[PDB]
């Protein structure tokens, strides 16, 4: 239901026609003009191709304390707190996952070298037994 980039149910629901991916209106307009492409893949896209999927989302239910101007803004507060509290942790998870990937790549390179070497070992072993 959620805009792929957003992750929660769009309040201005829009799919692009060319893609198959439903998007946030303001966000995906910014993004189509921000790289020129479809952010799901990198496909080239234009801003009108957006299709206004609007079936009147108005279902977002007031919770118990959130039903309040003091409450709605306090949860606004901890909400932005949590949005950045997720983004920065994703920054460092990228860093450690990326580091792990680099280590794995180096290990893979070492493995390829060993396989290349051990293959010379076996090929010469067999050519020798042929004598």
């Amino acid at each position: 239901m959620f805009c792929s980039i957003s992750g929660t149910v769009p309040e201005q629901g829009v799919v692009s026609t060319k893609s198959g991916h439903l998007f946030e209106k303001s966000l995906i307009e910014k993004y189509v003009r921000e790289t020129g492409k479809c952010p799901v893949t990198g496909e080239p896209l234009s801003t009108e191709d957006l299709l206004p999927l609007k079936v009147n989302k108005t279902v977002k239910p007031r919770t118990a304390p959130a039903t309040s101007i003091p409450g709605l803004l306090s949860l606004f507060h901890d909400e932005w707190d949590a949005n950045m509290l997720e983004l920065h942790n994703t920054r460092t998870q990228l860093h450690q996952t990326r580091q792990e990937l680099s280590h794995a790549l180096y290990q893979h390179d070492a493995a390829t070298r060993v396989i290349a070497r051990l293959l010379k070992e076996r090929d010469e072993a067999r050519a020798a037994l042929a004598d």
């Binding site: 803004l73 306090s74 507060h77 707190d81 950045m84 509290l85 983004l87 920065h88 920054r91 990228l94 860093h95 990326r98 580091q99 990937l101 680099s102 280590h103 790549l105 180096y106 290990q107 390179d109 070492a110 493995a111 070298r113 060993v114």
Partner: protein, 50 residues
Amino acid sequence: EEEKRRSTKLPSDYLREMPSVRAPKFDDHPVLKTEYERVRNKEPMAPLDS
């Protein structure tokens, strides 16, 4: 392990060849600028005006 021992360019930081993981792109909103500069230190915003 011995494959590793004498490996050619043993980095274990070989992320150098990995793409540059760039700085958080809000040079046009000081908002998220200061947001991240504090947030990585995790020193929270105080709750609002109790």
